[PDB]
Design a protein around this nucleic acid. Structure first.
Ligand code: MG
Ligand code: MG
Ligand code: MG
Ligand code: MG
Ligand code: MG
Ligand code: MG
Ligand code: MG
Ligand code: NA
Ligand code: NA
Ligand code: NA
Ligand code: ZN
Lengths: 98, 202, 71, 102, 54
RNA sequence: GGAACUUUACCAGAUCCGGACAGGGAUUGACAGAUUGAGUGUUCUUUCUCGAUUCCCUGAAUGGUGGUGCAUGGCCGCUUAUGGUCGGUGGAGUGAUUUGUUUGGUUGAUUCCGUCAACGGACGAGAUCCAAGCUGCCCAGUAGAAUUCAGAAUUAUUCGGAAUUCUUCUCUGCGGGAUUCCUUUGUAGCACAAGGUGAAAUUUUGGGCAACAGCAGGUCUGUGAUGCUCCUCAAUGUUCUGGGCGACACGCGCACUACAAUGUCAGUGAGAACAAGAACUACUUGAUCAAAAGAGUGGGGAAACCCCGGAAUCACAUAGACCCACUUGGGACCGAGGAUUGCAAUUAUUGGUCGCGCAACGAGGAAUGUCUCGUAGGCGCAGCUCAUCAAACUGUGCCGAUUACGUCCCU
């Protein structure tokens, strides 16, 4: 409906993106995407999630695949450093540490 | 509530079909050659088969952990309930899934088509195959499509048992102009349906 | 069927030379003998092999047979 | 005491017969009375569809079929004894459901 | 606005369901709750389990 | 591809940006009034919020049942349902090219047997796989049967509590069984005809898979398979509203119903198989102190419910009606009530009641399709499409024949 992404919901997806290290979203534009972050089942509309990851890819920050209507976004080493600056942290994702 | 038997079997069948398609697109350059899984009471372990297991694993299993988390999110598996292992294929000269990807590698590079197809046939025949066949077709030269096949050895083509003594694969290779599709058929050496041997007495 | 093929006729001749002293003119004993001295995945084929082997044995009892060398 | 009913169902014929033949031997080791196994009728799932992707030429169809196999064994032993009979590594494709009969 | 995609939001009719692979809405197979195109089924029948026997 | 919206690609109008990314108090929403098809901030007037998310110029990118199937991939159809296809070494020819791979018999078969400048091989055919028909082991408190004791009915036989036992029927994973096996004829090795054995006697029956070459055959409306193209911010992108794909006393293909007595109507009897079901399918009882279709209440489910699956052809010694006529044949067209599906039945969504039946039609010119035994023909039932609608397709069972078992006249 709207691609206007409020900032509070923009950082929530990024924190999940850095925490888990990967995001999967079914390609439907009438639907919502949920994620579990410390018990918070914060939800974003699919169209907003789809719009946020289109900007990261075109800046050479993530790697993307598609199979059976489902997206699969994975962030690059260039993206990893970028998210560290934006979120002001120094961890190593989650499937990277150990 | 529980689902019926007719629906449990079908629901567990479209899970394998989607899993195969997902792993086919990721580990295509690494040489994916089939995936199997076995549900237990504690976990849902899955086994992959590739000829480049070092590249599939990744640094400290990075690639395997990125693949692990993709499946968990899509199917909503709970944490600690899913596991994947990678095993190595025995002989790479007898899997048309890996051979076709070696062929595509030569084709996406500057390689002669005949010199490319002769390599695959000679290799698999040397590796111990019983019959091989390579087909390359579609806008090979000029604006008109053409088909070029290369056969060697013996190969059956009819009946039902032809689905067990023959392996096959396909791919679509994106050239600068048009598309090219290549197939490789390998005859893997139960006896043949119509062979009879008489035991030597004494 | 009506007419026998090369697969049946070639295989049914090796049986005669290797095992000539275990065969006679009866189809049912010959089939039991054949099923132990040969390998094949189809019982239909083994029935025809014992059918033609019985036919050969009758001809041998009369005169020599072309392509069969008992030695 | 109580009666426990085991249901075996799979898409492959050999896998079903391998698991059930295992359970009988394990059950006889525990000296447990057995009622079965019973070979329930197999359901056939069918889907038929046209071969052409464009609707041309002769109208040709193909039929795709699936089979489902089912067995049941009734034991006579409490839960702990059953928990030891069926604890093994069954191959993939086969499932076993535990039901307590009334 | 408020009217944007208001008809599809109903989710009732032949334009509601989509193939689980193609995301297409023509000639679906709803038998046994499959939701697959007729074309996709012939290319994935072996993986699902169906095999041509007769 | 049975289109009410959607599907929709077409027509008349209104929106949204779904132009990423770079270079040079932004902006997003809202009450009331007017504009409008719109109680749609679409825009205008008046204000009031939200806060760097996007806004204005360019390049670029994305999208597009937009274009070429004579630029392609893949798949499918046909040539072609036939028995075809091809190497190596050797012989012959200046060479293209030939032999093998022929001539006789036989077979559905380049299937086999003899002869031979050949000999060796390969694929196709055959073999393999699936289902039906007969049978062995295993097996049932999701299938059944027999027997004995309590009960109940008629004047031995019937009906519906407790028990024992047991696989004839049902269920099915792997096996058995048929092989020209036996006799005779015509006989000049391969085989054929009649008979026997037998559940089955000739590819046992019905299917599936099927070589080598080709078609400028179809599809860019399946696809996140694509080359090259087109348009790209009041756009061929996308959404919303309305209409069309259903329009006509015209032509053509394929179906359904009939033209009646071997029948129509009204009763009564006996009696299938394959399937599907939310985990929506369906029983019983109300409604019923009064049409049908409906409504409404309790419960039950996947060899356990639906179900002792009460199908229609069919049968009736039913001492029923009609009597050869466009008639109680036929049921097109139209009128007036009422109920149901749906957000929405005005181009009828469908079903039920009464009426119209004065609409052709009395067996069909020249031409023409399919068919050899549980077959043709006839009869219903499930699945699929599906909120509602099957004169269609994909399967299943029930009743069940006439003719030939030949030839090369037509193709
Ligand atoms: Mg309609
Ligand atoms: Mg519209
Ligand atoms: Mg498209
Ligand atoms: Mg063409
Ligand atoms: Mg030569
Ligand atoms: Mg009658
Ligand atoms: Mg139709
Ligand atoms: Na020739
Ligand atoms: Na053409
Ligand atoms: Na004709
Ligand atoms: Zn599809």
């Amino acid at each position: 409906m709207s691609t206007y992404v409020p900032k509070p919901s923009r950082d929530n997806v990024y924190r999940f993106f850095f925490t888990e290290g990967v995001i999967a979203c079914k390609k439907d534009r009438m639907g919502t995407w949920t994620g579990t972050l410390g018990g918070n089942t914060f939800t974003v509309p699919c169209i907003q999630v789809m719009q946020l990851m289109r900007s990261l890819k075109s800046r050479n920050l993530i790697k993307e695949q598609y199979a059976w209507r489902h997206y699969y976004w994975t962030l690059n080493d260039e993206g990893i450093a970028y998210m560290r600056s934006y979120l002001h942290l120094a961890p190593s994702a989650m499937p990277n540490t150990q | 509530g529980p689902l019926s038997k007719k629906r449990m079997i079908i629901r567990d069948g479209v899970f394998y079909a989607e899993l195969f398609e997902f792993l086919k697109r990721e580990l295509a350059e690494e040489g994916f050659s089939g995936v199997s899984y076995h549900v237990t009471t504690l976990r849902t372990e899955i086994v992959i088969k590739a000829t480049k297991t070092r590249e599939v694993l990744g640094v400290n299993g990075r690639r395997i952990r990125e693949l692990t988390a993709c499946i968990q999110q899509r199917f909503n598996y709970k944490e600690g309930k899913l596991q994947l292992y990678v095993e190595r294929v025995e002989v790479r000269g007898l899997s048309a899934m890996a051979q076709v990807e070696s062929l595509r590698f030569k084709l996406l590079s500057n390689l002669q088509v005949r010199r490319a197809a002769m390599g695959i046939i000679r290799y698999v025949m040397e590796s111990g195959a019983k019959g091989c066949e390579v087909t390359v077709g579609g806008k090979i030269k000029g604006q008109r499509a053409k088909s070029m096949t290369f056969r060697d050895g013996y190969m059956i083509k009819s009946g039902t048992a032809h689905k067990s003594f023959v392996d096959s694969a396909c791919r679509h290779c994106y050239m600068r102009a048009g598309c090219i599709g290549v197939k490789v058929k390998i005859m893997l050496p139960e006896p043949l349906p119509d062979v009879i041997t008489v035991i030597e007495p004494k | 069927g009506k007419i026998r093929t090369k697969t049946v006729k070639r295989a049914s001749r090796q049986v005669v030379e290797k095992y000539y002293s275990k065969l006679n003119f009866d189809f049912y004993q010959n089939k039991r003998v054949i099923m132990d001295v040969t390998i094949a995945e189809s019982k239909k084929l083994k029935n025809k092999i014992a059918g033609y082997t019985t036919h050969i044995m009758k001809r041998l009892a009369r005169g020599p047979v072309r392509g069969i060398s008992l030695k | 005491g109580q009666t426990v009913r085991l249901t075996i169902t799979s898409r492959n014929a050999k896998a079903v017969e391998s698991v059930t033949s295992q359970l009988l031997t394990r059950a006889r080791d525990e000296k447990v009375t057995i009622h079965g196994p019973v070979r329930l009728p197999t359901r056939t799932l069918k889907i038929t569809t046209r071969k052409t992707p464009c609707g041309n030429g002769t109208n040709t169809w193909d039929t795709f079929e699936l089979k489902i196999y089912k067995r049941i064994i009734d034991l006579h032993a409490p839960t702990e004894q059953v928990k030891k009979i069926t604890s093994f590594t069954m191959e993939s494709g086969v499932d076993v459901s535990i039901t307590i009969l009334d | 606005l408020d009217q944007w995609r208001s008809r599809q939001k109903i989710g009732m009719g032949k334009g509601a369901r989509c193939c689980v692979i193609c995301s297409n809405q023509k000639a679906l197979i709803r038998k046994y709750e499959l939701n697959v195109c007729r074309q996709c089924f012939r290319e994935n029948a072996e993986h699902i389990g169906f095999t041509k026997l007769r």
